[PDB]
């Protein structure tokens, strides 16, 4: 049994690491995009009006 808790907390925690891992990983790259396509669309309107 107390082999036991040595492992389970270990597999659980191993998992929290991945949770951290995702947490480390987070977006600005994404936020960037809408701004750009919103911007490119506008230049296209230029060229078109030109």
């Amino acid at each position: 049994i107390c082999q036991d808790v040595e492992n389970l907390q270990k597999f659980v925690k191993e998992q929290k690491q991945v949770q951290e891992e995702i947490s480390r990983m987070s977006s600005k790259a994404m936020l960037k995009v809408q701004e750009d396509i919103k911007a490119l669309k506008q230049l296209l309107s230029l060229a078109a009006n030109g």
Binding site: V12, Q19, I22, S23, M30
Partner: protein, 33 residues
């Protein structure tokens, strides 16, 4: 029962979080399409 307690609350705590994160990604994917 000191320990088991620790398990659940950690569990629900992270779960409540994981939930919110998945959601993030959903909303990000969201924005992608």
């Amino acid at each position: 029962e000191s320990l088991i307690n620790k398990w659940s609350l950690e569990l629900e705590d992270q779960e409540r979080h994981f939930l919110q994160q998945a959601t993030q990604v959903n909303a990000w994917d969201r924005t992608l399409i």
